[PDB]
Structures are given as C-alpha cells and as structure tokens.
C-alpha cells in the first residue's frame, strides 16, 4: 500500500518537477541584462527610538505611515510616533515573552502574542479612558509566531504547532484552519488585496493558500534550511523569502518556480527579516552580522548597506508610501532609516 | 494652532516616562530563570521544593521569577532564542540519559546561548544508580567507560549509602563536566548539584550559584576573571 503510494506521490512530484522545467525558457539575468543599474546608493539613520528595556522582536508600521508598534521581551508593548519620536502608549502585558505584534489597518486595534499561546487584542480608541484588554484568542497549542489583521473583526495567526487559523473576534472561535505544513510556522505575508497569503515554516517549504477555502494551493520549495521571513511583491504575484542558510530567493505565482537567488560568499549568517520597497526594485534583507543589506531585486547585487546596529536584527518594515524604513534589533534600539 | 497637540504629545510622554522609571527599576531587581528540564517529577517538585507556568518567589528579599516551559512541541530550535538574556538555565534530569547528554551539548554550543550559564541538577540519583545496583546491567549497556571508572578522591561522598552508587553518581556528574569545560572559555559556567529528596536548599543551591554567575559576570567586565 504505502510502497506504491509513495511512488504515486513521487511520480506526481516528478511530473510536476518537469512541468516547471518545461516552463524554463531562460533565466531572469538574461532578460535583465540591459536594465541600467541603480548603483552606488546609501541611506542614513535619522531617528532612534530608545525606550525599551529588553530586546525587540517585532514591529509593524501604520497605514498613515506615521505610527508604529514595538513589542519587546520586557513585557512592554509600545506605540510610537515616528515623526516627533514620542511614545503615544506604553501597554503593559499579561505574559512577558512576546514574539509578534499587529497594527490593524483601520488604526483602531493592536494585537500581540507569544509563548503563553494566546493572541491578545488591545483597543486603541478607549473612550472610557486608558487602554485595556478587549478580548483574546486561545486556540493554538504550540506558540505564536506571526499575525496580520484584515479588518477590526478577523485576523490570521501563525503558530508553532504547524497550524494557521482565521479568527472571529466577537465570538472568539476560529473560522477556518490551515493544516498543510509540517514544521513550526514562522511568518506569513498577506496579499495586497487580502485575497491570498503565503507562509513559511521550518520545513523549508512555502505554502500559498486561499482565505476563503482554507486550502493550500501551491507548495514552494527552493531552500535548504528553515525559513524565518517572507514578504509579498507589491502587486501580488511574487514574494521574497529569507531562510537560515543565508539566501534570499524569489518565487513567482504564475510560473510556479523560483526566479532569483540573492547570496554572496561573505554572508554566511542567517536571515531574520525581509521587506520590499514601494516600487519593488529595492529589497531589504536583515541579517545576523548586524547590518541590513539592501539587495537589488532585478540584478541580484547588494547595492546598499545599513550598518548601524549592535545586535541581531529581528524585524524590518517599510512604510506604505516608501518614505521610511524602521529596523529594530535585540539592543532595544530602533533606528528609523531614510 | 499646532502647539495645542504638541503639549499633549509632551504631557502624554512625561506621564508615560514616569511609569517606565517604575518598570526599569523593578526589571533590574528581578532574576529570570528557565526550567527546560525534561522531567515530570523534576519540573513540579522544585516548584514546592496555558503555554508557560510562571512561578514567582522571594528569598532574602530577592525576587525570582521561575518559568517552566509547558505546552510546547518537542522541537526547540526556535523558542530557545527567547532566553539568551536569562540569568540561569536550570537543567533538571530524570536510553534517557544519552539523550539528556546530547541535549545539554547543543545548549552549551549555541550561537545565541553561548553566554548564558547552566545550573545542572542530578535528580533521582538514589533511584537511578541503586536501581542499576540491584540490576547490575544498565550502566554497562549504556556506557563502556563505567567499568574503567574510579571514584575521585577529592569528592565529598556522603557517608551512609552504597559506595558504588557514588561511583556512578560521580560518573554521570563527570560526564556533563567534560562537555562544559571543553571549549566553553570563561563566559558561562556549569554548576552540578543533587538534593532531589528534601525541600532543604534546592533553591539555596540555586541562590548561592546565581549570586556566583553575576560575580563572574562583573569580573568578566574588568578583564580580571
């Protein structure tokens, strides 16, 4: 039974394996030979948000491109104003070890979660006075790695017991359940129209899903180690991926296979965060030798370097209009770059 | 016009800043511990003697926050980066024991846990050595060097037990020490103990060793130790 069914899955791999070999007309370096390059560019640290005690794990930008949230391991959840460097709110937490933070695109709710296995939802509007816990979500059994809001009523969450989930905030129960992976799920990136999303996990695979069906559409495999970060292209057909074997890759949803691989011999440390710029030309790749290296996305050349940190970077965001880049590392300092 | 929101952005800032200066001082006054020991009796007895069980307790008016890791999966490479800043890892123990040694090797040789110190316990030493000394077969088919092993004379063996329990009790203790001493280089230590039967000084041996780790840490910051 299992002997010929392993071969049946093997032959369905192998037929899939040569269909992408059928599609491979040429490499993308051959068609991007004559793109005149971006070349010698660089940035500068403009701000430094220094208010946290312990290490910073996650930040998320705002739809105004002005506010941002910082979650850190001291049990503090802190909203900033990036323009005037002012702490708008300083939320205390229930449990300390948090790993992810959410900022709803309505600007009206904030979530965070970690090893106490609960995504908690915090209200920002709070006309009764100070902020408080609105409701919280307890369905996962592993830990809690990522989360991304859709409206003020549903949020997709990424966990460590392999299962992603879509939630209903008023009734507190999960709507669907995503059971495709095998490892700890690490990060998920929403499509720009919130019709799809991809997710990376520790089993070196990248699953593309459907929010309405709860099913896995495609499986992307081009990495060698566990994957820490993922981020869509701005249109919705590509994503970049960062894994712990020091390589960034590019996978297109149409041709169903990989396109580019961003590596260099001197970088042999793992990747913790990636994000795209607004056009898509500049790809950012937070590293473990403590410097965010700006990678070209069409020519695979590390054109720019941001080198201002003391410890490992852990989170990296780009404003939705492309004015600023904020990176936060384990030294409790969040240099806003520009 | 624009000064009106400015002072509110000032007055919210200073009222927040006063709360942080309550929180930084209490955070520097409390020591976190990690209790990743793979033993069900060990993880629960040393409490008296969800996703995470927070136990807090004070001794000599010093605040400890002890954190048992509970509802997690068996893979560990992604949630022990959330503990590099801790004071002391309390590795409790219960082939079980080669898998115990293979785990303690990885923690000592992590890129991020390279600088954190390990307090090591030896649970059940009465019911893991004399259990073999009634069976006379279990260490030898787990270890060949035990028949070669001599009890070190600079040990302080307790009078009133089987001396060949203490032959194996010190053998296991000297099997963790050969991993910790080999290529650790002065930035993190190991502290073997065993109480495991009474409420007396399970925590005090942790107390008098957590006090040590900080003292090695400050003398590390002066190029002395």
């Amino acid at each position, epitope marked *: 039974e299992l002997d010929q069914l392993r071969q049946e899955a093997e032959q369905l791999k192998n037929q899939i394996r040569d269909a992408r070999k059928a599609c491979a007309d040429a490499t993308l370096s051959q068609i991007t030979n004559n793109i005149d390059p971006v070349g010698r560019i660089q940035m500068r640290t403009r701000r430094t948000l220094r208010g946290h005690l312990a290490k910073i794990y996650a930040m998320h930008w705002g739809t105004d491109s002005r506010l941002l949230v910082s979650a850190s391991q001291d049990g503090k959840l802190i909203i900033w104003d990036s323009y005037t460097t002012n702490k708008v709110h300083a939320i205390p937490l229930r449990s300390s070890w948090v790993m992810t933070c959410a900022y709803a695109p309505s600007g009206n709710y904030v979530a965070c979660g970690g090893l106490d296995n609960i995504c908690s939802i915090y209200n920002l509007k709070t006309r009764e006075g100070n902020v408080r816990v609105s409701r919280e979500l307890a369905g996962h059994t592993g830990y809690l790695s990522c989360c991304r809001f859709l409206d003020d009523n549903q949020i997709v969450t990424s966990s460590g017991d392999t299962t992603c989930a879509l939630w209903d905030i008023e009734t507190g129960q999960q709507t669907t359940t995503f059971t495709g992976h095998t*490892g700890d799920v690490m990060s998920l990136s929403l499509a720009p129209d919130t019709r799809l999303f991809v997710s990376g996990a520790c089993d*070196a695979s990248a699953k593309l899903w459907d929010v309405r069906e709860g099913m896995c559409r495609q499986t992307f495999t081009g990495h060698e180690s566990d994957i820490n970060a993922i981020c869509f292209f701005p249109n919705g057909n590509a994503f970049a991926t960062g894994s712990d074997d020091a390589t960034c890759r590019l996978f297109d949803l149409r041709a169903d296979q990989e396109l580019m691989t961003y590596s260099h011999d001197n970088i042999i440390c793992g990747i913790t965060s990636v994000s795209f710029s607004k056009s898509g030309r500049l790809l950012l790749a937070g590293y473990d030798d403590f410097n965010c290296n700006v990678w070209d996305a069409l020519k695979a050349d590390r054109a720019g370097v941001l080198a201002g940190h003391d410890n490992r970077v852990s989170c990296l965001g780009v404003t939705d209009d492309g004015m600023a880049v904020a990176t936060g590392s384990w030294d409790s300092f969040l240099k806003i770059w520009n | 016009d624009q000064r009106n929101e400015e002072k509110a952005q000032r007055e919210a800032n200073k009222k927040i800043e006063k709360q942080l200066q309550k929180d930084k001082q209490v955070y520097r006054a409390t020591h976190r511990l990690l209790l990743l020991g793979a033993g069900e009796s060990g993880k629960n007895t040393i409490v008296k003697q969800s996703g995470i069980f927070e136990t807090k307790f004070q001794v000599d008016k010093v605040n400890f926050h002890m954190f048992d890791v509970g509802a997690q999966r068996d*893979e560990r490479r992604k949630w022990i980066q959330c503990f590099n800043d801790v004071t002391a890892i309390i590795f409790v123990v219960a082939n079980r024991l080669q898998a115990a040694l293979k785990l303690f090797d990885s923690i000592w040789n992590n890129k991020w846990l390279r600088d954190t110190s390990v307090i090591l316990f030896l649970n059940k030493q009465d019911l893991l050595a004399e259990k073999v000394l009634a069976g006379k077969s279990k260490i030898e088919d787990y270890f060949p060097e035990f028949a070669r092993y001599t009890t070190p004379e600079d040990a302080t063996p307790e009078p009133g037990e089987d001396p060949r329990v203490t032959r194996a009790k010190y053998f296991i203790r000297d099997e963790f020490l050969r991993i910790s001493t080999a290529s650790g280089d002065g930035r993190h230590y190991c502290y073997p103990h065993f109480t495991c039967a009474v409420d007396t000084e399970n925590i005090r041996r942790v107390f008098n060793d957590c006090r040590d780790i900080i003292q090695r840490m400050h003398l590390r910051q002066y190029e002395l130790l």
Partner: nanobody
Amino acid sequence: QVQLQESGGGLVQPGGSLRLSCAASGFTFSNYKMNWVRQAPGKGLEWVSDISQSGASISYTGSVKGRFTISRDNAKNTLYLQMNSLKPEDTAVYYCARCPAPFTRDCFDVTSTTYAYRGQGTQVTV
C-alpha cells in the same frame, strides 16, 4: 527540494556486518554536521552517531562504541555507516539526518514528529 534516501539493510545472521548509505539531494553537502538516528520498535527515537563537516569530530553512543564506524564523502555527497559485529537487539529502523543549519555545531534533531530533514529510513533486522 531536499530529500534523504537511506539504502541497505535487510537480514543478517546475529554477528555479521553491514554498511549503509544516505543519498543526498539539492544542498551544499560540505556545510552540515550529519548524523544517524535509530528507533527500536516499541520505543522512541534514539541517537546513534554523528560526523562533522570535514570528518574530524566523530562520536558515538556508548552501546555501539567501537563496533560501528561512520564516514562521509564531501566529494560524492553521501553518508556512510559501516557496521560490524551486529546484535540481536540492534534491530531497529535506521534514519539519516542533518542538523538544521550550516556552519554551526549544535543539533536539535533526535525527536520524532517530522523533523523534516531526516529520511524515512531503512530496516535492519537480525
């Protein structure tokens, strides 16, 4: 895509000898500290051996010390475990594994429950 194919195994009279192989796929073989893991029936998984990148560091389990050996080939990207003087109680499913990251020392892969950088294994009997 990475995948691991162990080969060999089968039957032996109690006391014989055997080798094993590990077919690698799709990664830089010269980077990863690799290892063997067995699992007896009726019991959980247990660690057998390991070899480093070059082949300098080599360690074993105490029960199987001396009688076995491990060797790697960083030119033809396969892993080799030659076993000698086999036992009646060594009958177990033998997997080939890889520690999850390049250029390191630590490993966290003795577990069951899809450590997804191990192969499905081969059966050795006696």
